[PDB]
Amino acid sequence: DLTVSLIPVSGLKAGKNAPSAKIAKLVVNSTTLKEFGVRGISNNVVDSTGTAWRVAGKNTGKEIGVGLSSDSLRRSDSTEKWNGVNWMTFNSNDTLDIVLTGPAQNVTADTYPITLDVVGYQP
């Protein structure tokens, strides 16, 4: 199987944020599987691989754009299909960054939930 940790970044501040500001670290380890696929899960996924999506603040309902960082995307081993559904794959025993996507975002102070689905892949 896989052991997955998703770690929120400390010290995030409301207001204008840097482009691609890091917001969480994804850690996927395995003793048995060489690779994994990952997709964001929300009410508004915005690309065909599910590696960028939008999430709503708990207290305000305001939306922010989140996703894998461009560096993280460039570490993908491949994009594979599971019965037709795209999953970008990555080496296990790696970390990836989840960021604020696109140009600089102005973020209202709030708590924003993020959900990912991770699946093992044998190449």
Partner: peptide
């Protein structure tokens, strides 16, 4: 290649932006 359906996991966390 193949996906291992039984290995699929969902993980969720809260991201907090403070004033």
């Amino acid at each position: 290649g193949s996906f291992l359906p039984n290995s699929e996991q969902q993980k969720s966390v809260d991201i907090v932006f403070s004033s």
